[PDB]
Amino acid sequence: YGRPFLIIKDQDRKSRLMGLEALKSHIMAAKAVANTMRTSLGPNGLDKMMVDKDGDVTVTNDGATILSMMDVDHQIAKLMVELSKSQDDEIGDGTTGVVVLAGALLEEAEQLLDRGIHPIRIADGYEQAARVAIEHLDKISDSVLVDIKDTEPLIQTAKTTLGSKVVNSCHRQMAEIAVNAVLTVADMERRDVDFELIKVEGKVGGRLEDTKLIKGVIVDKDFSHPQMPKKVEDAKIAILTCPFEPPKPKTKHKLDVTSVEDYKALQKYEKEKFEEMIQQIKETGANLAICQWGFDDEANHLLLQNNLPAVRWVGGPEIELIAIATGGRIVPRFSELTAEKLGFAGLVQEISFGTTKDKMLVIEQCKNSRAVTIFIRGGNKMIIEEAKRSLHDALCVIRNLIRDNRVVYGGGAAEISCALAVSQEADKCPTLEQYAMRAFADALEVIPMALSENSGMNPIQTMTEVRARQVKEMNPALGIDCLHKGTNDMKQQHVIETLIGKKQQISLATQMVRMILKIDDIRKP
Amino acid sequence: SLAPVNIFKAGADEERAETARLTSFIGAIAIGDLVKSTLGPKGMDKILLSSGRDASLMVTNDGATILKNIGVD
Amino acid sequence: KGAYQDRDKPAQIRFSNISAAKAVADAIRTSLGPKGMDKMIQDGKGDVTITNDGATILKQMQVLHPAARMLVELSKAQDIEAGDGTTSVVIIAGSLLDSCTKLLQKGIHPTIISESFQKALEKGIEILTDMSRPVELSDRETLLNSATTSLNSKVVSQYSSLLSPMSVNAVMKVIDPATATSVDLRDIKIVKKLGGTIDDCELVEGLVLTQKVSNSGITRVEKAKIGLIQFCLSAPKTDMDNQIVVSDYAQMDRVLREERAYILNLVKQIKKTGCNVLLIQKSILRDALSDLALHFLNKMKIMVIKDIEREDIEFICKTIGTKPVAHIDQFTADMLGSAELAEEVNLNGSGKLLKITGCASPGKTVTIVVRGSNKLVIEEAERSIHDALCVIRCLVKKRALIAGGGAPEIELALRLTEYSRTLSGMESYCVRAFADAMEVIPSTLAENAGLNPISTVTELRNRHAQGEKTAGINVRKGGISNILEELVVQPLLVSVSALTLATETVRSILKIDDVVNT
Amino acid sequence: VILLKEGTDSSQGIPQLVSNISACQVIAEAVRTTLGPRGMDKLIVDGRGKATISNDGATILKLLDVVHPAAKTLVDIAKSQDAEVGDGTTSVTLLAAEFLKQVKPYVEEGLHPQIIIRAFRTATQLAVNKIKEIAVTVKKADKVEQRKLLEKCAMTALSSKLISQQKAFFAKMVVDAVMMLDDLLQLKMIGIKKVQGGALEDSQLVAGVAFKKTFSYAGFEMQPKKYHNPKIALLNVELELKAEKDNAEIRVHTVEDYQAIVDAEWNILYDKLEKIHHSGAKVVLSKLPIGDVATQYFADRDMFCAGRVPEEDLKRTMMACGGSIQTSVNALSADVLGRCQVFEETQIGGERYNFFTGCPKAKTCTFILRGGAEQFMEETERSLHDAIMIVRRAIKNDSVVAGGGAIEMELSKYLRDYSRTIPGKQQLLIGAYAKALEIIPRQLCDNAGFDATNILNKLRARHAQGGTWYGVDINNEDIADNFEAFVWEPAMVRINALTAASEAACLIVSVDETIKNPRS
Numbered sequence A: 001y002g003r004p005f006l007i008i009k010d011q012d013r014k015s016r017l018m019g020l021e022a023l024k025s026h027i028m029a030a031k032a033v034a035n036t037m038r039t040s041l042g043p044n045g046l047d048k049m050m051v052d053k054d055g056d057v058t059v060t061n062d063g064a065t066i067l068s069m070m071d072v073d074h075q076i077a078k079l080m081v082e083l084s085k086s087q088d089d090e091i092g093d094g095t096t097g098v099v100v101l102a103g104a105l106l107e108e109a110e111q112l113l114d115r116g117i118h119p120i121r122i123a124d125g126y127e128q129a130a131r132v133a134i135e136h137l138d139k140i141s142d143s144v145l146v147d148i149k150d151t152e153p154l155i156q157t158a159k160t161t162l163g164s165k166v167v168n169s170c171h172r173q174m175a176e177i178a179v180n181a182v183l184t185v186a187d188m189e190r191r192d193v194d195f196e197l198i199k200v201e202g203k204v205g206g207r208l209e210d211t212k213l214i215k216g217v218i219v220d221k222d223f224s225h226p227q228m229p230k231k232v233e234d235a236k237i238a239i240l241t242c243p244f245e246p247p248k249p250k251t252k253h254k255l256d257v258t259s260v261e262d263y264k265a266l267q268k269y270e271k272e273k274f275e276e277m278i279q280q281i282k283e284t285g286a287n288l289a290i291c292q293w294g295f296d297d298e299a300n301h302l303l304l305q306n307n308l309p310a311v312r313w314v315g316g317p318e319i320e321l322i323a324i325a326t327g328g329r330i331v332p333r334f335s336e337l338t339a340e341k342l343g344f345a346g347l348v349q350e351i352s353f354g355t356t357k358d359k360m361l362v363i364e365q366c367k368n369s370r371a372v373t374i375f376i377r378g379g380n381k382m383i384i385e386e387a388k389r390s391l392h393d394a395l396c397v398i399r400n401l402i403r404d405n406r407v408v409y410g411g412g413a414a415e416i417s418c419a420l421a422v423s424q425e426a427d428k429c430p431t432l433e434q435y436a437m438r439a440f441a442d443a444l445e446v447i448p449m450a451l452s453e454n455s456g457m458n459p460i461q462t463m464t465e466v467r468a469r470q471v472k473e474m475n476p477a478l479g480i481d482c483l484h485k486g487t488n489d490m491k492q493q494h495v496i497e498t499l500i501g502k503k504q505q506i507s508l509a510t511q512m513v514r515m516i517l518k519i520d521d522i523r524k525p
Numbered sequence B: 001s002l003a004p005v006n007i008f009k010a011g012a013d014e015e016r017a018e019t020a021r022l023t024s025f026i027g028a029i030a031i032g033d034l035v036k037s038t039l040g041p042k043g044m045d046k047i048l049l050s051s052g053r054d055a056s057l058m059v060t061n062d063g064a065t066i067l068k069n070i071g072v073d
Numbered sequence C: 001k002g003a004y005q006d007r008d009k010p011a012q013i014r015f016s017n018i019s020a021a022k023a024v025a026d027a028i029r030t031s032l033g034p035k036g037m038d039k040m041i042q043d044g045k046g047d048v049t050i051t052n053d054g055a056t057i058l059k060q061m062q063v064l065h066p067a068a069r070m071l072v073e074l075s076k077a078q079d080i081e082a083g084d085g086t087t088s089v090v091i092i093a094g095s096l097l098d099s100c101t102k103l104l105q106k107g108i109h110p111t112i113i114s115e116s117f118q119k120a121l122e123k124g125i126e127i128l129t130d131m132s133r134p135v136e137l138s139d140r141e142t143l144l145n146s147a148t149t150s151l152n153s154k155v156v157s158q159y160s161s162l163l164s165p166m167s168v169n170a171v172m173k174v175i176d177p178a179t180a181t182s183v184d185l186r187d188i189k190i191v192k193k194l195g196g197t198i199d200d201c202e203l204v205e206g207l208v209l210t211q212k213v214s215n216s217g218i219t220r221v222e223k224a225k226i227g228l229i230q231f232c233l234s235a236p237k238t239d240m241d242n243q244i245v246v247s248d249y250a251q252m253d254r255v256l257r258e259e260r261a262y263i264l265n266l267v268k269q270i271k272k273t274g275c276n277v278l279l280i281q282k283s284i285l286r287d288a289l290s291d292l293a294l295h296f297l298n299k300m301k302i303m304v305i306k307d308i309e310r311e312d313i314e315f316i317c318k319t320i321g322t323k324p325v326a327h328i329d330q331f332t333a334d335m336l337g338s339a340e341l342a343e344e345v346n347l348n349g350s351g352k353l354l355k356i357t358g359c360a361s362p363g364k365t366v367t368i369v370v371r372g373s374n375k376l377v378i379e380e381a382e383r384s385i386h387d388a389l390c391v392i393r394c395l396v397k398k399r400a401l402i403a404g405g406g407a408p409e410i411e412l413a414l415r416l417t418e419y420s421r422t423l424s425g426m427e428s429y430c431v432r433a434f435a436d437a438m439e440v441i442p443s444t445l446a447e448n449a450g451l452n453p454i455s456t457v458t459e460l461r462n463r464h465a466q467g468e469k470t471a472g473i474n475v476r477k478g479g480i481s482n483i484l485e486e487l488v489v490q491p492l493l494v495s496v497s498a499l500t501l502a503t504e505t506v507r508s509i510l511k512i513d514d515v516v517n518t
Numbered sequence D: 001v002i003l004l005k006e007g008t009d010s011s012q013g014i015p016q017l018v019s020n021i022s023a024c025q026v027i028a029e030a031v032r033t034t035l036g037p038r039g040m041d042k043l044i045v046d047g048r049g050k051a052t053i054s055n056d057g058a059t060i061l062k063l064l065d066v067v068h069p070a071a072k073t074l075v076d077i078a079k080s081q082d083a084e085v086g087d088g089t090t091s092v093t094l095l096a097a098e099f100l101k102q103v104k105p106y107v108e109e110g111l112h113p114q115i116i117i118r119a120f121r122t123a124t125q126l127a128v129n130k131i132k133e134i135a136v137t138v139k140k141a142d143k144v145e146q147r148k149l150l151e152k153c154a155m156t157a158l159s160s161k162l163i164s165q166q167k168a169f170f171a172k173m174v175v176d177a178v179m180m181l182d183d184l185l186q187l188k189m190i191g192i193k194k195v196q197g198g199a200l201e202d203s204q205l206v207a208g209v210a211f212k213k214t215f216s217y218a219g220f221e222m223q224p225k226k227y228h229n230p231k232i233a234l235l236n237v238e239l240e241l242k243a244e245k246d247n248a249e250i251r252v253h254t255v256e257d258y259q260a261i262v263d264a265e266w267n268i269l270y271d272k273l274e275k276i277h278h279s280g281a282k283v284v285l286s287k288l289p290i291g292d293v294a295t296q297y298f299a300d301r302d303m304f305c306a307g308r309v310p311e312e313d314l315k316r317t318m319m320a321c322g323g324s325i326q327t328s329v330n331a332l333s334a335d336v337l338g339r340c341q342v343f344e345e346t347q348i349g350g351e352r353y354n355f356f357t358g359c360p361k362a363k364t365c366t367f368i369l370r371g372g373a374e375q376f377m378e379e380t381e382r383s384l385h386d387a388i389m390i391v392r393r394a395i396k397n398d399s400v401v402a403g404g405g406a407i408e409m410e411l412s413k414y415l416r417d418y419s420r421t422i423p424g425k426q427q428l429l430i431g432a433y434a435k436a437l438e439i440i441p442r443q444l445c446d447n448a449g450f451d452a453t454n455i456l457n458k459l460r461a462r463h464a465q466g467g468t469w470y471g472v473d474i475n476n477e478d479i480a481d482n483f484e485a486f487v488w489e490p491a492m493v494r495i496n497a498l499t500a501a502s503e504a505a506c507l508i509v510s511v512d513e514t515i516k517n518p519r520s
């Protein structure tokens, strides 16, 4: 009939993309994201300079962080950002690898569906090739020793991870501090690593060489009432929660002083309360007092004249870390502070950080301290932030290696070996589905191509030559000589990737590309 | 990224080529040229004049406060 | 190790050009082969067209990308050179540009790709020449086969049985099939009039006029003596300023009588030569026909046709064998055109059409009149007839005939892949990409027909690998079969021109590295 | 003066009904491409920018903003089919639209709506009766065959979803989550917790209860995270310093009484904590917050605390361990504290999750499903809910029927045979009903990229006399015995789809005029 009928509210402005054009748009956005993430891959990659809406700038190479700050509007780009963030969450390394692999897989999928093949068939082929690749990756891996006695493989893995980041300026002490921190914090019996016990703290000034690992706790406070000594030797500490103030019940209360004698009694009660507080702090024998909630002038002076240094306003997590390091117990009231409830401190020192007024305390332990602290120093806020995120990457790699123990020899060797396995399997496969398998092989094999292109070498010829070397001599540890030291063999160059990291990369990218291929219709205002 | 699809937002942009390093280099060289005329015992100091509240005016030679007060983009 | 090539704008521009070309190719991909359905274009003004020819689709569609404009110029150049394949050439160019985008991504200089594409084209031309078979004229069967093949992918396909034989007869009745080396389509006048149906199209060996007879008393003439006129049958007037001064009352009578006598003299000289139908050239600045002149012509039982375009005089002279006169003293029967019959036919109330048929003098010219219900089918029918005529022109140009339905380009893909396998270096990948980017045509023919593209292309490659040449897609069978036995063939010039033009324009596109707004 | 308010728009007669029918087809076209194993996916962007990705009829139709009353009826039928049996939301919408499309030719001329409504009612009654009398029931009551039936039904449910490639991994999994439920099949007794990171096959079924780390204070990370035979103290009381009654006023006039009251508040808190500790429990849980003082108190005695747990998770812990929530602390007996084989706090994808696993008599479950994006795990949760709902419905009666369009073709053949004995015009309408019921295999073939007409003709020829249960085999591009191919569906989904589609078609047809007010 002549009358045009309206079914959907506000349907004159809504937009709809349907059929193959929508899939083309999806693949195109994914290709754009992958091309953006391609340059900053591998040791020769270059950083990216992200500025937020507030105008503050950060220079970073972490793909998950770059995509998270990428203020993007396309839905496929949002899915790619979520992919990168999830890969960061589960593993902590290879955040750009998943994005590049997904982009390559979607590009090959576009090439395939140009030939009129169903997207679900492409997804099934991708899944089969991912299974083959994961099986080959588990077959190819070898194990390292996670022990303090021979820690060197841990340094090798952390040094390989710390490559392609600015902290490779040092590249040796960073791996050492990461390995030591994770080894100290880790609970080896449960094979669990807690990241709340590694208080990664940074401060500008100095050099990147000054970044150390305190086997104790650093806190951004100072000794109250500065007349007290700026450092104490091995001291007994009293971690405390209640403030050094006269008590008051939580329930609302009224204390009627009905006479002058009542007034004098209240005065005497307050004064003797302070005096008894200090006396029962001193009687335990502790040299250092630490309070979470701060206190007043009389407490300061009584603490000073009793030769008992103290600090205040220490935060909750900082209180917990201090008590774990010193071995003491957090007590919420003065009346239950016994000798057993003190902690031990190797030495408590105050540091001034040059000409600035800022001060900090360092607590060093002479005994076993389950907690540590990584202190970062540098010449820029951007350097500090990049350094701490790079060290977080290293810690994540070390804990992943604690919980899995198996490694593969990266640098492109793993991808090339998986590609050969996928292609060899796809040889003996019935047609109409081997196309997806070969597309998967090429898509995962683009990673050495991008690595070589970032390294400055010709990608295709070098990649073909190293693949021929891998297939001639059964040495699946031949990768792109990105650093230009010769020796295509990657055993000698000591490059280590974690098995779970690579297998998670492959599986997660395959699942994301399957979801992207599944989408058909888009309705958006 | 110059592709015929735009994905960032109404206001977000990307420079992924020699344009980015061009902008960074010209900005850094502009800052350096701003500081350059205040070196040595024969250097001459500069005037920092506000464009707003209370119109703060300060005469200074060291580059720390010169770079802190001005608003770089 | 190597050049840093800090500038990235050239790469962005190259990828943008490749993407635009691929998009333009995909736009008309679904308008190829017998099963491809035509596009509908409506320009800024409310004028519409139903077009299946790629050149028309690309011209009417006002594109904005430089790669798209270069592609539309390529399509129109291919139409000019051959007249068929103006879709396949664009598809080939876009497809192999999309092939070379990954070559660019693989770290290959554009010059190497261009040179390797040139070498691949050089091999492919020889492959096509070997694949062909000689074709020679006076074999009406193969000419009808080529015409039907050219018309299959058009709306007039169901009329091809009553429209292809006349399409080839038009060409065979204009040029000598012994020593031609070329034909002209200018002397094939396609006249279109609205009304009727397609089955009412006609081919006339005579002459067709859309003009109207001035004297509505005479309609038909048997044994017509046609004579063109280039001067004017009105009151005399010199080239320079003309003036008549009257000073007496007898002078008005004298001037009226003298003008009447002059006109009557002219008409008497025209009539005494035996001329029975007159053709007056469309003249301006002087009335070609005067009412008194027309009255005298009607009195002497003559038929008059006036307002004839200047550019049509050559066509009329070549058709009916008459010679124009610009002076009355040279109007003689010795150089007066003759014809068996002149008729004015009313087209069932849709129009009035003038036919000069049975010209005794030889005529190296035919005229096609096309009929249709609405105007869109008439436009598409004349375009399809033009395509068939261009196909016959290709056959006349060079005598080489190849198979169709995907067979030539798939055989070319196989041969060129085998040639690339013996070209180790950085050009091996480029020749392989060129070879595998010419499978787009069989894939498009398969998917446009509802077939399975992957299996169809794979079975085609298998069939041509075993040497079973001239094997291609068949849409009547719905599969793959020998095409020659199915009577589908095309001249070799179309394929060779398409391949060469596409390769040259792709090399030109690859040479681009920057775009700047002027 | 005019009768109605200004701006009132009324439509009457045949054109209004035909426009309503066309609106029905247009709204059912939005979910048409989401059937069968080759089903595609729909992405809907809200006005807030959030995009939801799914391929079930109910969710897509709900997300679409519908203002046409007939399209509103289609939305309601999809949502009600979702709320009744859980699976078959796209089928009801497609069936309604196809009924209306098949009958619109007959409504173009002067056909009285009552007669076609009666034809629908008769056809649907016969169809439901045939489905009831065709579905096969094993009637053996054996655990192995019941498990196989539930696994196959769940596997068929997981097809046409995002979790297709892992059907077998998830299907049997959800069966276990329904095996370990009591004889009430409450849907709140199996929880779903979504966490970013990891592969799709990394998901797990906790037979006890798992929940995200709620909160912690200064004193956490000191009590041990591993107990090998603990007792769980489910609580509903906050253990922290606070006012006694939120209006209690303390009135004293001596400092001794003031100190006594301060010590009294501390003493009441410590006595409550001492009762909790002396109860013998090792790990304690509370809906109300747990203060830092109680955290340190339990840390000093190797006891785990966890405050501000959600209500549903605490009830799931009740159903797993077998305790009871005590608002009061004076009566921590020994038969009220639940016990579990193992308690353990672990790291899952950047979050801390508490696990109570190994409960011998568990009437609850927890789904730790992994994914790469929030929409990925949300769609996985949607598919899992579909599967658990279908298993929950099928557990009441194990009467199954072959899917893949086999049952639709069987009913179409039955109705075609029946609509030859009936004389008059009702024969044409019942034939239209059968031709409409013929839609599902055609749409499956279309989504799978088949030759739909050829496969339909093959099905009709092989199914007129060659045997029932024959549906479309997508992988083999052909027709196959879908019952012997283990594509099973409970008959209730088809029964409900047919009856709902008939009801919606009758409601749409039975309208002759519509009025729109100026919506003041």
Ligand SMILES: Nc1ncnc2c1ncn2[C@@H]1O[C@H](COP(=O)(O)OP(=O)(O)O)[C@@H](O)[C@H]1O
Residues within 6 Å of the ligand: A040, A041, A042, A043, A045, A063, A093, A094, A095, A096, A097, A160, A161, A162, A163, A164, A165, A410, A411, A412, A451, A479, A480, A481, A482, A483, A495, A497
């Ligand atoms: N010394 C090296 N030689 C060759 N390849 C390396 C080397 N170091 C790292 N790579 C490779 O670079 C790739 C990217 O590493 P990187 O950019 O540091 O972190 P991410 O994996 O998060 O992108 C890894 O897949 C690794 O195999």
Ligand SMILES: Nc1ncnc2c1ncn2[C@@H]1O[C@H](COP(=O)(O)OP(=O)(O)O)[C@@H](O)[C@H]1O
Residues within 6 Å of the ligand: C031, C032, C033, C034, C054, C084, C085, C086, C087, C088, C149, C150, C151, C152, C153, C154, C403, C404, C405, C406, C473, C474, C475, C488
């Ligand atoms: N009957 C047919 N069977 C199979 N293929 C055909 C048939 N007719 C034409 N083709 C193929 O369709 C292709 C396109 O031809 P057409 O659309 O007529 O002109 P253009 O080449 O300009 O697109 C040709 O390459 C030809 O091989």
Ligand SMILES: Nc1ncnc2c1ncn2[C@@H]1O[C@H](COP(=O)(O)OP(=O)(O)O)[C@@H](O)[C@H]1O
Residues within 6 Å of the ligand: D034, D035, D036, D037, D039, D055, D056, D057, D087, D088, D089, D090, D091, D156, D157, D159, D160, D161, D403, D404, D405, D406, D440, D444, D471, D472, D473, D474, D487
């Ligand atoms: N393995 C299979 N083979 C063929 N058809 C199937 C298969 N699995 C499901 N189907 C068909 O898919 C239809 C249901 O599609 P689906 O999207 O899974 O649920 P919904 O009914 O909610 O749309 C059913 O009619 C069933 O016949």
Ligand SMILES: [Mg+2]
Residues within 6 Å of the ligand: A093, A094, A095, A161
């Ligand atoms: Mg890394």
Ligand SMILES: [Mg+2]
Residues within 6 Å of the ligand: C084, C085, C149, C150, C151, C153
């Ligand atoms: Mg043609």
Ligand SMILES: [Mg+2]
Residues within 6 Å of the ligand: D087, D088, D089, D157, D160, D386
């Ligand atoms: Mg379903």
